[PDB]
Design a binder for these strands. Structure first.
Lengths: 51, 51, 57
RNA sequence: AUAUAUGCAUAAAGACCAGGCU
């Protein structure tokens, strides 16, 4: 579901060149600070007081 | 078509999608008797266009 | 071999210079004529040799 | 003694890089 199982070149590039599937997408990147804030608000304990 | 007689065996017959490829005989035919030669080795050059 | 392969000939003291047939003249663009890699390398070697001589004197 | 020359009717780029062809 991420790359085409059938489409690939022949020769030295066989299997090393892929084509994305129709529904496939690539992540852009989001800040991780809201994730850390949500985790801390939902009771995550830090590594400083790890016993 | 030659005689108008019935064919003994029936023929699978129907429309089908076909596509023309970029591989034409007039773009690949090549012949050479005598022509340009390389400066260094004095051997015939490489390339259909360059004779 | 005494007659053909003498050991001290393995060390280079004089360098042969091949004719321009070995290193044919090249032309980068029309009238301007370039030089092959061998021509430039021989020029650099000769420049180094004349530098050695002129700094030795 | 001739006379100036004031003129030129083919030269062959090759080496690398990338993408394809069976």
């Amino acid at each position: 579901g991420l790359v085409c199982p059938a489409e690939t070149p022949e020769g030295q590039a066989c299997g090393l060149v892929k084509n994305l599937s129709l529904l496939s997408g690539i992540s852009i990147g989001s800040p991780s600070e809201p994730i850390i804030n949500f985790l801390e608000e939902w009771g995550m304990e830090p590594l400083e007081d790890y016993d | 078509g030659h005689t108008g007689k019935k064919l003994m065996a029936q023929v699978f017959f129907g429309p089908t999608y076909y596509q023309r490829l970029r591989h034409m005989v007039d773009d690949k035919i090549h012949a050479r008797a005598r022509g340009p030669v390389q400066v260094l080795t004095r051997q015939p050059v490489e390339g259909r266009s360059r004779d | 071999n005494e007659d053909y392969a003498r050991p001290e000939w393995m060390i280079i003291t004089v360098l042969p210079v091949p004719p321009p047939q070995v290193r044919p003249s090249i032309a980068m663009d029309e009238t301007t004529q370039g030089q092959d890699d061998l021509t430039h390398k021989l020029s650099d070697i000769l420049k180094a040799n004349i530098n050695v001589q002129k700094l030795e004197m």
